[PDB]
Design a protein around this motif. Structure first.
Motif, PDB file in Angstrom:
ATOM      1  N   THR A  40       0.960  -1.212  -0.030  1.00  0.00           N
ATOM      2  CA  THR A  40      -0.034   0.012   0.034  1.00  0.00           C
ATOM      3  C   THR A  40       0.938   1.124  -0.102  1.00  0.00           C
ATOM      4  OG1 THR A  40      -0.432  -0.315   2.512  1.00  0.00           O
ATOM      5  CG2 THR A  40      -1.940  -0.884   1.069  1.00  0.00           C
ATOM      6  N   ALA A  41       1.991   1.482   0.698  1.00  0.00           N
ATOM      7  CA  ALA A  41       2.801   2.600   0.879  1.00  0.00           C
ATOM      8  C   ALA A  41       3.602   2.758  -0.528  1.00  0.00           C
ATOM      9  CB  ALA A  41       3.842   2.707   1.921  1.00  0.00           C
ATOM     10  N   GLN A  42       3.917   1.625  -1.042  1.00  0.00           N
ATOM     11  CA  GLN A  42       4.553   1.387  -2.440  1.00  0.00           C
ATOM     12  C   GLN A  42       3.686   2.133  -3.598  1.00  0.00           C
ATOM     13  OE1 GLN A  42       6.506  -2.649  -1.380  1.00  0.00           O
ATOM     14  NE2 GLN A  42       5.658  -2.296  -3.144  1.00  0.00           N
ATOM     15  N   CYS A  43       2.313   1.740  -3.612  1.00  0.00           N
ATOM     16  CA  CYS A  43       1.369   2.320  -4.519  1.00  0.00           C
ATOM     17  C   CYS A  43       0.992   3.764  -4.125  1.00  0.00           C
ATOM     18  CB  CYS A  43       0.201   1.359  -4.339  1.00  0.00           C
ATOM     19  SG  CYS A  43       0.389  -0.461  -5.073  1.00  0.00           S
ATOM     20  N   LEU A  44       0.985   4.042  -2.871  1.00  0.00           N
ATOM     21  CA  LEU A  44       0.612   5.579  -2.513  1.00  0.00           C
ATOM     22  C   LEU A  44       1.725   6.441  -3.193  1.00  0.00           C
ATOM     23  CD1 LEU A  44      -1.289   7.366  -0.729  1.00  0.00           C
ATOM     24  CD2 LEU A  44       0.334   7.002   1.260  1.00  0.00           C
ATOM     25  N   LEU A  45       3.194   6.125  -2.922  1.00  0.00           N
ATOM     26  CA  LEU A  45       4.250   6.875  -3.464  1.00  0.00           C
ATOM     27  C   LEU A  45       4.005   6.840  -5.041  1.00  0.00           C
ATOM     28  CD1 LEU A  45       6.669   8.988  -3.115  1.00  0.00           C
ATOM     29  CD2 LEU A  45       8.168   6.746  -2.754  1.00  0.00           C
ATOM     30  N   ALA A  46       3.843   5.618  -5.440  1.00  0.00           N
ATOM     31  CA  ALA A  46       3.628   5.571  -7.003  1.00  0.00           C
ATOM     32  C   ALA A  46       2.466   6.868  -7.410  1.00  0.00           C
ATOM     33  CB  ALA A  46       3.138   4.231  -7.413  1.00  0.00           C
ATOM     34  N   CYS A  47       1.660   6.678  -6.887  1.00  0.00           N
ATOM     35  CA  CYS A  47       0.587   7.746  -7.476  1.00  0.00           C
ATOM     36  C   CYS A  47       1.104   9.146  -7.176  1.00  0.00           C
ATOM     37  CB  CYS A  47      -0.397   7.429  -6.424  1.00  0.00           C
ATOM     38  SG  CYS A  47      -2.044   8.705  -6.707  1.00  0.00           S
ATOM     39  N   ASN A  90      18.711   9.751 -11.220  1.00  0.00           N
ATOM     40  CA  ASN A  90      18.899   9.566 -12.776  1.00  0.00           C
ATOM     41  C   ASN A  90      19.370   8.154 -12.747  1.00  0.00           C
ATOM     42  OD1 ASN A  90      19.241  10.843 -15.411  1.00  0.00           O
ATOM     43  ND2 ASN A  90      21.317   9.638 -15.133  1.00  0.00           N
ATOM     44  N   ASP A  91      20.255   7.821 -12.061  1.00  0.00           N
ATOM     45  CA  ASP A  91      20.897   6.211 -12.242  1.00  0.00           C
ATOM     46  C   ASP A  91      20.073   4.983 -11.800  1.00  0.00           C
ATOM     47  OD1 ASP A  91      23.137   7.679 -13.111  1.00  0.00           O
ATOM     48  OD2 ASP A  91      24.460   7.558 -11.357  1.00  0.00           O
ATOM     49  N   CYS A  92      19.570   5.387 -10.748  1.00  0.00           N
ATOM     50  CA  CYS A  92      18.266   4.458 -10.191  1.00  0.00           C
ATOM     51  C   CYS A  92      17.079   4.387 -11.196  1.00  0.00           C
ATOM     52  CB  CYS A  92      17.916   4.659  -8.843  1.00  0.00           C
ATOM     53  SG  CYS A  92      19.396   4.513  -7.695  1.00  0.00           S
ATOM     54  N   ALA A  93      16.785   5.507 -11.560  1.00  0.00           N
ATOM     55  CA  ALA A  93      15.975   5.298 -12.921  1.00  0.00           C
ATOM     56  C   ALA A  93      16.167   4.549 -13.935  1.00  0.00           C
ATOM     57  CB  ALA A  93      15.374   6.811 -13.125  1.00  0.00           C
ATOM     58  N   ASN A  94      17.359   4.700 -14.603  1.00  0.00           N
ATOM     59  CA  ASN A  94      18.006   3.810 -15.626  1.00  0.00           C
ATOM     60  C   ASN A  94      17.937   2.430 -15.022  1.00  0.00           C
ATOM     61  OD1 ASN A  94      18.160   5.918 -17.626  1.00  0.00           O
ATOM     62  ND2 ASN A  94      20.038   6.776 -16.993  1.00  0.00           N
ATOM     63  N   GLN A  95      18.182   2.061 -14.069  1.00  0.00           N
ATOM     64  CA  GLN A  95      18.385   0.700 -13.304  1.00  0.00           C
ATOM     65  C   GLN A  95      17.235   0.025 -13.377  1.00  0.00           C
ATOM     66  OE1 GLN A  95      21.184   0.136 -10.032  1.00  0.00           O
ATOM     67  NE2 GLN A  95      19.796  -1.119  -9.360  1.00  0.00           N
ATOM     68  N   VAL A  96      16.035   0.552 -13.157  1.00  0.00           N
ATOM     69  CA  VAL A  96      14.739  -0.109 -12.713  1.00  0.00           C
ATOM     70  C   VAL A  96      13.767   0.162 -13.831  1.00  0.00           C
ATOM     71  CG1 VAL A  96      15.057   0.009 -10.355  1.00  0.00           C
ATOM     72  CG2 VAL A  96      13.765   1.888 -11.507  1.00  0.00           C
ATOM     73  N   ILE A 107       8.360   1.380  -7.916  1.00  0.00           N
ATOM     74  CA  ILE A 107       8.646   2.570  -7.205  1.00  0.00           C
ATOM     75  C   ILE A 107       9.287   1.791  -5.868  1.00  0.00           C
ATOM     76  CG2 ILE A 107       7.775   4.191  -5.662  1.00  0.00           C
ATOM     77  CD1 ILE A 107       7.837   4.858  -8.837  1.00  0.00           C
ATOM     78  N   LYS A 108       8.950   0.712  -5.530  1.00  0.00           N
ATOM     79  CA  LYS A 108       9.647   0.089  -4.498  1.00  0.00           C
ATOM     80  C   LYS A 108      11.156  -0.074  -4.861  1.00  0.00           C
ATOM     81  CE  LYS A 108      10.370  -2.361  -0.638  1.00  0.00           C
ATOM     82  NZ  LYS A 108      11.555  -3.248  -0.667  1.00  0.00           N
ATOM     83  N   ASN A 109      11.470  -0.693  -5.837  1.00  0.00           N
ATOM     84  CA  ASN A 109      12.954  -0.893  -6.350  1.00  0.00           C
ATOM     85  C   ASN A 109      13.707   0.228  -6.436  1.00  0.00           C
ATOM     86  OD1 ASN A 109      13.412  -4.047  -6.211  1.00  0.00           O
ATOM     87  ND2 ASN A 109      11.245  -3.640  -6.974  1.00  0.00           N
ATOM     88  N   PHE A 110      12.793   1.413  -7.074  1.00  0.00           N
ATOM     89  CA  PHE A 110      13.522   2.587  -7.446  1.00  0.00           C
ATOM     90  C   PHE A 110      13.978   3.483  -5.900  1.00  0.00           C
ATOM     91  CE2 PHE A 110      12.572   7.278  -7.570  1.00  0.00           C
ATOM     92  CZ  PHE A 110      13.310   7.880  -8.282  1.00  0.00           C
TER      93      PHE A 110
END
Length: 118
Positions: A40-47, A90-96, A107-110
């Motif tokens: 739920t927190a993962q989804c909340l942040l994603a939104c 930037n680098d984490c976005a590229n990784q995931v 978003i959890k993995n990011f």
């Protein structure tokens, strides 16, 4: 900067509570930038990250120049270690990016990747 993040994200996370079945505790987890242990927190942040302008129409985390208005909104550029935060994001976005079909998993993995970055 803890309070500046909260100032920018708070209203968005609050709005997201209306479209994500997250708890009051999840709200605090996200505002405090704590590990997103609950789905739920993962989804909340994603939104909220979609609302703040970090996610492309196709569901990718923005990188490069596209990241900068978000970094500005969240943190401003008065602190040197926003320079450092921007590079990690930037680098984490590229990784995931493209690796997780579930948006909340993305978003959890990011965020783990960002947290783990020096």
């Amino acid at each position: 900067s803890t309070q500046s993040y909260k100032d920018a994200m708070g209203p968005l996370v609050r709005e997201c509570m209306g479209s994500v079945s997250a708890t009051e505790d999840d709200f605090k987890t996200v505002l405090n930038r704590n590990p997103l242990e609950s789905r739920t927190a993962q989804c909340l942040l994603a939104c909220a990250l979609d609302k703040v302008g970090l996610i492309s129409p196709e569901g990718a985390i923005y990188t490069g120049d596209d990241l900068m208005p978000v970094m500005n909104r969240l943190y401003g550029f008065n602190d040197f270690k926003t320079v450092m935060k921007a590079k990690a994001v930037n680098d984490c976005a590229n990784q995931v990016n493209g690796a997780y079909p579930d948006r909340c998993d993305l978003i959890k993995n990011f965020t783990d990747c960002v947290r783990n970055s020096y």
